[PDB]
Amino acid sequence: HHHHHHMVHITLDRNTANSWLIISKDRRQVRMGDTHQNVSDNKERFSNYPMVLGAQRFSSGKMYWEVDVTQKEAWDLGVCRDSVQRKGQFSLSPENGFWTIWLWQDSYEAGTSPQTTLHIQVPPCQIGIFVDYEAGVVSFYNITDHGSLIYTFSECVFAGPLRPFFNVGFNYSGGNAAPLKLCPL
Ligand SMILES: CNc1ccccc1S(C)(=O)=O
């Protein structure tokens, strides 16, 4: 792929974070804390899952960014509507405003309804995410495997502004503490 030149500088929005997340000073890394992080509740915070949004909102154009997932056992990445539900239980699907892939229990899947099996020969340490707003496309790339395509959502019906979306995952196993990191341009 030749999407690198649409690179955008993404930062995390503290105000949207689940109350157990720890966002770095530069707003480029997030990890699961071992407890509540001593913040007030607000209507923007994801309550049920270890999720956070990017600060940037996109309503046009082509955008590209990269995320480091090294040594994590579980995570979700992609984009979502600015108006997605924050409280209670929900599935990651385009019907609910999410265009995502994930790792869970040693398998990679795209957040369709129902979910789609991904075929990845080289487990990725960094994921590239490409959004073409006008075309209705979200694509995922394996940076560890020379940029190979992972998955394309096409005919997307965004139906509003988009925000970068992250889930660091739970750490019940003690093997998923590592952060998600936004990689330098
Ligand atoms: C960057 N991760 C971090 C930061 C502070 C404390 C512990 C960790 S760890 C390597 O145990 O996930």
Swiss-Prot record:
Mod. after translation: Autoubiquitinated; does not lead to its proteasomal degradation. Deubiquitinated by USP4; leading to its stabilization. Autoubiquitinated.
Annotated B30.2/SPRY domain residues: 8-185
Localization (cell): Cytoplasm; Cytoplasmic vesicle, Autophagosome; Nucleus; Cytoplasm, P-body
Signal peptide interval: none
Induction: Up-regulated by IFN.
Domain characteristics, as noted in the entry: The coiled-coil is necessary for the cytoplasmic localization.
Family membership: Belongs to the TRIM/RBCC family.
Function of the molecule: E3 ubiquitin-protein ligase whose activity is dependent on E2 enzymes, UBE2D1, UBE2D2, UBE2E1 and UBE2E2. Forms a ubiquitin ligase complex in cooperation with the E2 UBE2D2 that is used not only for the ubiquitination of USP4 and IKBKB but also for its self-ubiquitination. Component of cullin-RING-based SCF (SKP1-CUL1-F-box protein) E3 ubiquitin-protein ligase complexes such as SCF(SKP2)-like complexes. A TRIM21-containing SCF(SKP2)-like complex is shown to mediate ubiquitination of CDKN1B ('Thr-187' phosphorylated-form), thereby promoting its degradation by the proteasome.
Subunit and interaction comment: Homotrimer. Component of a SCF(SKP2)-like complex containing CUL1, SKP1, TRIM21 and SKP2. Interacts with CALR, CUL1, FBXW11, HSPA5, IKBKB, IRF3, SKP1 and VCP. Interacts with SKP2; the interaction with SKP2 does not depend on an intact F-box domain. Interacts (via N-terminus and C-terminus) with DCP2 (via N-terminus and C-terminus). Interacts (via C-terminus) with IRF8 (via C-terminus). Interacts with ULK1, BECN1 and with ATG8 family members, including GABARAP, GABARAPL1, GABARAPL2 and MAP1LC3C/LC3C. Interacts with TRIM21 and SQSTM1/sequestosome 1. Interacts with IRF3.
Protein name: E3 ubiquitin-protein ligase TRIM21
Whole-protein residues included: 291 to 468 of 470
